[PDB]
Amino acid sequence: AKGIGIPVKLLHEAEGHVVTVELKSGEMYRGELCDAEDNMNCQLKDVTATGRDGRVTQLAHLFIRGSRVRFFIIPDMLKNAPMFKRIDPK
Amino acid sequence: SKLLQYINFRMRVTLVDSRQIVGRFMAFDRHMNLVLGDSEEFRRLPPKKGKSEEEREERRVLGLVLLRGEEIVSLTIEGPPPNPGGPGIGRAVGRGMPA
Amino acid sequence: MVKLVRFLMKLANETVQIELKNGTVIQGTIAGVDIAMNTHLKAVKLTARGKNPVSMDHLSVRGNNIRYYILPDSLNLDTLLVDIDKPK
Amino acid sequence: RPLRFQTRSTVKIAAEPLNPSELPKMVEGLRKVSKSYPLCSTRVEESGEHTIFGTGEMYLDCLMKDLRELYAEVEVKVADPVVAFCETVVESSSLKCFA
Amino acid sequence: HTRRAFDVPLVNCWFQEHCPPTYPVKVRVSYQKLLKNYVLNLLHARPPKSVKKKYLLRAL
Amino acid sequence: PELKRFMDKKLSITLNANRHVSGTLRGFDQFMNLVLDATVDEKLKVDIGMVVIRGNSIQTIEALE
Amino acid sequence: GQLLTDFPDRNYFYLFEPQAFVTAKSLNMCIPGGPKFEPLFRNDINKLIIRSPIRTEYKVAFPYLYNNRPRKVRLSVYHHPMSLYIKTEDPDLPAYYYDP
Amino acid sequence: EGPLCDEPIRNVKFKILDAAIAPEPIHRGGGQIIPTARRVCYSAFLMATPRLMEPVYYVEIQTPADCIAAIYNVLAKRRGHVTADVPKPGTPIFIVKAYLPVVESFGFETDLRYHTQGQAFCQSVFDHWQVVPGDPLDKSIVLRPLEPAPVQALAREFMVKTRRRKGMSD
Amino acid sequence: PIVAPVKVKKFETLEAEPLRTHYSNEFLATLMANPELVRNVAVVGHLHHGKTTIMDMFVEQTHELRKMTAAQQAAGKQLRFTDTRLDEQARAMSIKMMPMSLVMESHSGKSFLLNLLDCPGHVNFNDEVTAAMRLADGVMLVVDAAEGIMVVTERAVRQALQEGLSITLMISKVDRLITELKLPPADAYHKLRHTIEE
RNA sequence: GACGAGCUGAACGCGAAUAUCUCUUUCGCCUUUUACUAAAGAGAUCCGCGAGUUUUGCUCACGCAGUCGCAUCUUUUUGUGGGGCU
RNA sequence: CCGAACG
Ligand SMILES: Nc1nc2c(ncn2[C@@H]2O[C@H](COP(=O)(O)OP(=O)(O)OP(=O)(O)O)[C@@H](O)[C@H]2O)c(=O)[nH]1
């Protein structure tokens, strides 16, 4: 909406896909994001937890606080978002 | 911002924990969020004497990544961006002569 | 509108130094500072904690991880100090 | 499972191509009509003529239009429309009928 | 756009607001002929083709 | 917020300095304060009753179901 | 207005628009208050049923259903939606008003 | 098919009371009784007072009050049963429930617009079946070509012309 | 003819290249390959109650067709996108249902691909309807604010519940409350409420 | 990151107004030809019309100007610091 | 429907 920057609407249109979440603590979280917040709080499902020691754990759902999160890994499929193409020089 | 001059331009990022992220620029948010295409994590391992600092920084390939400004500390450039006819005629004519 | 980022955004083309939150040192020219205190510098050299200096044609630094600025000794402070009370 | 409409092709029309010399494409038209109109129904009798089954005024109207122009291009005479009559009981027969 | 005064028909509405049964025979016949030419000029206006003009009085 | 999809469900809530409290949700705020029923400290093995956790006191939450 | 006398709807001319008259001429059949047009070009009783007469507004309102050999026609009686506007008369009532 | 019109038989019960069957399978294949089953259907229904059935369009007519009477007038000419005239909440148009048979729907939307000057517009959907009045097998009425029969002779001449078209004798 | 003219076979004349849209080709290619961003919806209503025009407004907001609109209001007709066959056109009627999936926006900015199937609403075309309705798992019933419920609306509603569909109400043509009927805002609330209640 | 009325030129294009003509046929007037009728088609013409810079003719008018190379309490720019183990 | 020239 008016006021909102592009990459969070990127995050929103990433909905319904399987992505990865790195938080500032260093562990990795792979799962299907259900929906996310303006404040980057997000809910994934089918959760793979990769702990700081390589620990692999199975979590049904995850709600991740955004200001806890470092970055997101998102399919380049979705890097075809209309913002990406529209801004593009060609 | 002047980092509008910087979309599509390949760049490197430092995190607070000093981990390195190299990717190309797609979109930027006011919160210093960034969109990195073709991103890879270079994490500095401790330098074990007898080897170059340049030859064993652990590279992981992250793919497409997006960066929250809160832990974004420093950004630099890495490289460049990767890769009426008019009313004229000409006709053959002899030159006329007066005699 | 605070006084001081009001002062800092007029540091355009200032050849100054910066200390980072974790102890990195940066000497370079301020091409811009914005309302978030994020600075883009030109003609830069950045020297990390215990690290060799490396020069940068240009550099970006987040306003929040900035520890502080080292301003020029040649600074007409009282030039840039007027107008800070002026709302535009 | 096939489409279980709400509606039935309750109206029926007769179709006789003005030129019998083009009854193949006529039926091919009818055939291709049976291509685009889910409720279209083509039925041949002991009378041999092709009766066509539609909801009512507009459906048979536009099916006759597209039959005329879309598929066959053979102009066909259609008799007065008439609908399908079912056959029911009033009260049960008084004798048991054998065959 | 402005029209040419003779382009503007002034009795066209009389073909829309449809006949009341109070029409003497002559007026009904005349109304019918007018409404016929009406629906016909409406319908079959053959747009000819755009071959380009002369402008007699501009040239003169 | 999606915490609404969690109403009255047993949860595992991780907090600052590596702490886990597991209790059936009771309610939340815009500041993401959370009130829990029958919460258990997974470190010391203690069911700590009904609790409120602070917003920035929420690293993550998992749904055991 | 007194010359216009009153407004037309696209409504009223359901078999009085041009399309009525195209269907008229293409079938050699003409509206009762409708004009004449000379031809463009030039049935078993026991097996065919009449419970109501095929009228001319009938063949004129569905030209291809009710007519053998219809041609050169544009479309037929398609109706504009009903118009629920009635002339508010006196300028004193509110702009917006319930019609009795 | 059925015997009266070779059109679908509806609302009919076929109760098996007796079959005296030949004992061995070759005496009782399909080729022996499939005609016989159809013949017992023909006969058993034929003597059960057989009657004819119409489809009845569910006709809904939105109309102003100006045109209500002519609605009723033309459908009355076309034997349509008006069910009701519900004044629409919030508009000056009345929806009108009617049941007008599909036979009697021929050119109906037109004439309904024509004697209302078009302020009314009606819709018709297939609704149900019901029985054609009269005696459909009847002979006690010898009927008119080119003229419509009355209520008392419809079911008769209707299946009659049915047969005559479908290729059957009267 | 003795020399048969090589005719444009004027059946239904479409355009000669994929048009300009506010999204790409590969963007829709992306949004298709994952079920959680695709909604199948058939749009049904009575005769004329606004279905074709609503589909057209969707097209108008998500595509690039402005000079088309200028040609429309210069020629004196309003656009009908899904009414493509120039004979379904010249009767102001949808004759055969036509599909279209548009990449539309949410309030979240997440673009969803919505498969809307513009249907005929005239009763005798219910056949088209069921096809689209067995195609799409959801339905949008466009009931026109003015005239309320009609035949084809509730008959498609029975079609909608029989095939177990997500039925969604679109009160179209609300301006007929303001401009034709001139019902005040309060009586407009009553009439809208009564239509959804019906 | 920004400004037209009137004429003749533009070169491209047919909201609602429509008359005439030619041709190929049929039909009707009917002694013949013009001059006509009304049908089918195929072709023209007239009287007009819209937008782009071409300026001719203002009789209007301009340049520190409207615009330049989101501003401290749990969710964002006021970060949780410090140490140390392989 | 409906009138002019010519022969
Ligand atoms: N007053 C008003 N008229 C509208 C509105 N939307 C459409 N219309 C008109 O309603 C007419 C019929 O709507 P359509 O676009 O044909 O929609 P429809 O109901 O699918 O009609 P069918 O194609 O016959 O099924 C249009 O030609 C418009 O003039 C609206 O919002 N208000």
Ligand SMILES: [Mg+2]
């Ligand atoms: Mg002579």
Ligand SMILES: [Mg+2]
């Ligand atoms: Mg002589």
